[PDB]
């Protein structure tokens, strides 16, 4: 079985060689392609890529903020709001709006064939812009022999940035759900729309093609945990990470 | 250049193989895979499924029939409200609501950059079951060199009788609004969230896989067409059209 970080890889390579040139909102160059997807498994193993250090402990803290609800960008400080953007998740506050999370969990207990386990992030900026604005995300979750997969679909996906990290968050989310269903881990599934490079992230770019992936690492979570809200960043242990060097993108 | 169609044919040869048993919400028995993408050119031609005659009069007339913004289903008497489900595309009736469809077709005019230009669709019988219900679908535009491409994202995708129908539909749909924005067709991207085929369309389908696609069709707009509610039944010719026989999957 092929490492399913070639995939990564592979639309790295396949952006550089056929991406078109395209402005983002700030105008600032990319090479574009639209339209991906990549399959990993989260079966005894978890997408960490390893072709750079991923800043783990970033994931980590910053998908259990969103978890929690906050909107005190203070409040994360564990030592430009993307590319997750959970600020939704919880609340539209101890029971205001609808609780997207806590939904996905209930429907996944309550009838796991539903085809609509379905969460949706917004960029913050959208939501003054217009009326029903567009998520910027919608993560699908899927279960079938005791598996829980997910799906995620970005309508944009920063390749040399975003998406790495991304890949590391919604794994680590389909874990955790995993864990409190009594599921195991199945597929993270990542779809995207305009997936692209910044101009200024190529050479980097390039020069982590060179790099040889290496067996991706297994995330332990070291304590049984029965509600979403319970883990805590020391509940996790991720081992046998073994990346290439940090490669900074410089945004 | 391999064709397009053998994107389908391999994604049910895969579900036939991989798919694993899953109930649907009637409990009647699908094999089903999560996650999936196929890519159609729309260059010069146009995805009109080959190994078995598809209903392309009421691909046509039901789009229209959404265009409209109809709600009287006998409005819809051209000679199970899927699987296209557009009844909030116009409206959610003069002004009232959010119009998706102008919307989309505005930003592509004012800003084609924009990486927000979706569209979702409801199944209605999900709207009185709960606040904030998840789309059956969402499709994405993008435009690069003139070119405007289009991505549906469906949360499940019937690959007997609604996917080849669905394929139709918004290329279509993107044939009428490049036409209308003075762009070309780029590419038709379909991705599924769970992908299945009924129990009792297997062997039909077994069957329709040992067919060789031929050349897609054209699509010709015969007019000078404006506003996208001006295009009529009339304005659209289907040339070039040499499929396999009918296949009745019996639902
Ligand atoms: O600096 C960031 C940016 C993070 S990091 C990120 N994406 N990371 C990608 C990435 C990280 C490590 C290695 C490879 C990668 O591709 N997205 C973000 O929102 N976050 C941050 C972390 C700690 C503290 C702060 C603060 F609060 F601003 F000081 C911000
Ligand atoms: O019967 C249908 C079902 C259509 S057809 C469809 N999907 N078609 C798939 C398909 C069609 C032709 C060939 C191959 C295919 O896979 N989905 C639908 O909603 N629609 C219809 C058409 C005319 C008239 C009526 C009415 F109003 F009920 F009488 C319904």
């Known amino acids: 079985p092929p490492h399913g970080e070639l995939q990564y890889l592979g639309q790295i390579q396949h952006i550089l060689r056929c991406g078109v040139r395209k402005d983002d909102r700030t105008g600032t160059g990319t090479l574009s392609v639209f339209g991906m997807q990549a399959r990993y498994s989260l079966r005894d193993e978890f997408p960490l890529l390893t072709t750079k250090r991923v800043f783990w402990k970033g994931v980590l803290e910053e998908l259990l903020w969103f978890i929690k609800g906050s909107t005190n960008a203070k409040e994360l400080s564990s030592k430009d709001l993307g590319p997750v953007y959970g600020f939704q998740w919880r609340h539209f506050y101890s029971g ?42 919608l993560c699908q979750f899927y ?29 680590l989310l389909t874990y955790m759900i995993a864990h409190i269903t009594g ?69």
Request: hydrophobic share 35%.
């Open 96 to 137: 205001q709006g609808v609780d997207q999370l806590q939904r996905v969990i209930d429907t996944i207990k309550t009838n796991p064939d539903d085809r609509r386990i379905i969460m949706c992030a917004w960029n913050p900026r959208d939501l003054p812009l217009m009326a029903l604005p567009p998520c910027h995300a």
């Open 143 to 171: 279960v079938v022999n005791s598996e829980l997969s997910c799906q995620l679909y970005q309508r944009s996906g920063d390749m040399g940035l975003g998406v790495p990290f991304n890949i590391a968050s919604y794994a």
């Open 183 to 251: 599921l195991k881990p199945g597929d993270f599934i990542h779809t995207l729309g305009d997936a692209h490079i910044y101009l200024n992230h190529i050479e980097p770019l390039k020069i982590q093609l060179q790099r040889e992936p290496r067996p991706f690492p297994k995330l332990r979570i070291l304590r049984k945990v029965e509600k979403i809200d319970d883990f805590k960043a020391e509940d996790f242990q991720i081992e046998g990470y073994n990346p290439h060097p940090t490669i900074k993108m410089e945004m």
